[PDB]
Amino acid sequence: AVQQNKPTRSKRGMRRSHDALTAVTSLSVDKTSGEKHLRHHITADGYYRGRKVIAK
């Protein structure tokens, strides 16, 4: 249930191919406050679609 010969560092790297994270690239700037909030996510202060939504 174990290895037979150790895998090469080359074969090690190929297994790490599909491990890079994906960047966001969807930072919608708010209409009024202009924060860098994600789409369909409220801002850091609680603004969404140009509205004090959180009341906080």
Partner: protein
């Protein structure tokens, strides 16, 4: 394989699942807005909505029924007296879901669930 199946387990047995919604609903009504995890928030939508629909009418039977579940005199008095008349006109949809951030410590997607009104 849950074809056409509803509900969510939320990694809990039924009794605990049910009892935490009994607590979460009353926690909402007393505060009108709470922060919770997103999947929990979506499942709360199928619980409080029946109660506001239960408060759109009023009787003694409904008062006992909304006391049958939710088990609180304070909440049932918060219900049937203010939330009912406040939502007398709306045909369903008494909750809003706002996705806040990410709970650093378990990376959970948290969200804000509140009443539609919240007029101050």
């Amino acid at each position: 394989m849950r074809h056409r199946k509803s509900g969510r387990q939320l990694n809990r047995n039924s009794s605990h699942r049910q009892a935490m919604f009994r607590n979460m609903a009353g926690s909402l009504v007393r505060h009108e807005i709470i922060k919770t995890t997103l999947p929990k928030a979506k499942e709360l939508r199928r619980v409080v909505e029946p109660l506001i629909t239960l408060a759109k009418t009023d009787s003694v039977a409904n008062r006992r029924l909304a006391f049958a579940r939710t088990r609180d005199n304070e909440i049932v008095a918060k219900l049937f007296n203010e939330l009912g008349p406040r939502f007398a006109s709306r045909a369903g949809g008494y909750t809003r879901i706002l996705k806040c951030g990410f709970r650093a410590g378990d990376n959970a997607p948290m969200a804000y669930i509140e009443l539609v009104d919240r007029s101050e």
